[PDB]
Design a binder for these strands. Structure first.
Ligand SMILES: [Zn+2]
Ligand SMILES: [Zn+2]
Ligand SMILES: [Zn+2]
Ligand SMILES: [Zn+2]
Lengths: 71, 73
DNA sequence: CCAGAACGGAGCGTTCTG
DNA sequence: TCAGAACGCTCCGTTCTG
């Protein structure tokens, strides 16, 4: 039902994890040509439908912790 | 010399406060439109040149705390 | 010197396709 | 089934104008 990264409504299983479409292509973009991501808080940001744009570092970390892989 | 919002190099006294150009146009954009920004941390994000884009909520709060206002004469 | 507009780049999220 | 391309919107920061 819900994206395992940002809790938005999931569209399917993308890169081995149940995610939404926005998290799908975010993860693809993050893995290619790393993007100089730095958290402004404590490496523990809240990632939800709105707040996910705030911290790509924490978003990317959550993607990996959920087990996203390009295969 | 240093922007009181993000500590980047200041470009002048803008909206009443010593700030850089980016914080100048950010504050103007924030006050004249919606500023319903949400912090994903604990409302104490580090705002500097590298991270000021991460949290508009905390950047706007630092603008207000430093005293920025549109009608600074 | 400063306010405001404008321009171009980056990041993001959707739609579309096979 | 889902991976990928591509378009357009938003946000940003520098340069330009008044
Ligand atoms: Zn998601
Ligand atoms: Zn974070
Ligand atoms: Zn600044
Ligand atoms: Zn914040």
């Amino acid at each position: 039902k819900l994206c395992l990264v940002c809790s938005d409504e999931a569209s399917g299983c993308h890169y081995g994890v149940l995610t939404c479409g926005s998290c799908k292509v975010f993860f693809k973009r993050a893995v290619e040509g790393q993007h100089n991501y730095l958290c402004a808080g404590r490496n523990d940001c809240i990632i939800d439908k709105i707040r996910r744009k705030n911290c790509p570092a924490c978003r990317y970390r959550k993607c990996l912790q959920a087990g996203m892989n390009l295969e």
